Write a protein that binds this ligand. Structure first.
Ligand SMILES: CC(=O)N[C@H]1[C@H](O[C@@H]2[C@@H](OC[C@H]3O[C@H](O)[C@@H](O)[C@@H](O[C@H]4O[C@H](CO)[C@@H](O)[C@H](O)[C@@H]4O[C@@H]4O[C@H](CO)[C@@H](O)[C@H](O)[C@H]4NC(C)=O)[C@@H]3O)O[C@H](CO)[C@@H](O)[C@@H]2O)O[C@H](CO)[C@@H](O)[C@@H]1O
Ligand SMILES: [Ca+2]
Ligand SMILES: [Ca+2]
Length: 129
């Protein structure tokens, strides 16, 4: 089962959409839902390596946030916080609050202000048969 919609990229049972264009986090969430996916959830280094390669180098939203309880991050797929790739020193909840996670150009994660307008965002889906 390895089929993906047009413009999506297949990798290991999932499909990925590398959206481009300035969006707030909540905007990327709803954009992924509009394309029948969710902001990407990352659960292994192999998935991260795949994502880092094709990712927008100016940063991109991923599906990780601590809106519900400060300091407790949750993926869109509701699976555990098992694989992590935090940039050293992150998360730091800097500024007046950072509750949404982005990938840096290095693939390392940084929590950011949810109202920041990042230029990339990644959705995922399940591949079908
Ligand atoms: C309050 C004030 O005086 N404001 C001034 C401001 O003064 C400067 C400001 O510092 C802002 C930076 O302060 C720290 O160095 C960091 O917390 C930094 O955060 C960025 O980098 C850290 C990593 O070190 C991240 O954890 C953090 O989330 C943020 O990361 C960046 O996030 C964006 C999206 O939000 C992402 O796209 C970037 O890629 C990412 N960058 C990195 C490297 O990861 C702060 O941004 O306040 C200080 C006082 O504490 C001053 O000393 C600073 O000079 O200056 C502006 C003009 O420059 C002025 O208008 C404003 O009033
Ligand atoms: Ca936070
Ligand atoms: Ca941060």
């Amino acid at each position: 089962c390895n089929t993906c919609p047009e413009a999506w990229i297949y990798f290991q049972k999932k499909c990925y959409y590398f959206g481009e264009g300035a969006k707030k986090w909540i905007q990327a969430r709803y954009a992924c839902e509009n394309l029948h996916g969710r902001l990407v959830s990352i659960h292994s280094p192999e998935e991260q390596d795949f994502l880092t390669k094709r990712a927008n180098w100016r940063g991109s939203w991923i599906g990780l946030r601590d809106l519900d309880i400060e300091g407790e991050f949750i993926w869109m797929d509701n699976q555990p916080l098992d694989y992590s790739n935090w940039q050293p020193g992150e998360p730091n909840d800097a500024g007046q609050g950072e509750n949404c996670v982005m990938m840096l150009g290095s693939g390392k994660w940084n929590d950011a202000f949810c109202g920041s307008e990042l230029h990339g965002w990644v959705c995922d889906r399940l591949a079908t048969c």
